[PDB]
């Protein structure tokens, strides 16, 4: 029991749930998608110099 309870600590950031979040990260790839669209908007911007 002392092992089990103190095995709980996680100390540093560990993986039980932290492991779950990894699959989620891809969502930012969608966030990056917009950032590219912002650059596409620069086409509209400099198009106005042309």
């Amino acid at each position: 029991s002392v092992y089990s309870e103190y095995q709980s600590k996680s100390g540093v950031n560990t993986n039980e749930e932290l492991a779950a979040l990894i699959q989620y990260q891809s969502s930012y790839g969608a966030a990056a998608k917009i950032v590219s669209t912002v650059d596409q908007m620069l086409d509209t911007l400099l198009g106005l110099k042309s």
């Binding site: 749930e17 779950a20 979040l21 989620y24």
Partner: protein, 50 residues
């Protein structure tokens, strides 16, 4: 509103894990072969038995 969607990510793991723990708890009764093994389950019965 916003944080809620992200925490269901947290919650479901908690929910399934808890069910796993209850499954684990049942398995401990298999190991014990007893209704309880301490007082934090039922002291009255625990004491009643004594």
């Amino acid at each position: 509103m916003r944080i809620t969607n992200k925490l269901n990510f947290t919650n479901s793991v908690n929910n399934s894990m808890g069910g796993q723990s209850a499954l684990y708890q049942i398995s401990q009764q298999l190991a014990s072969g007893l209704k309880i093994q301490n007082s934090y389950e039922d002291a009255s019965t625990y004491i009643d038995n004594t």
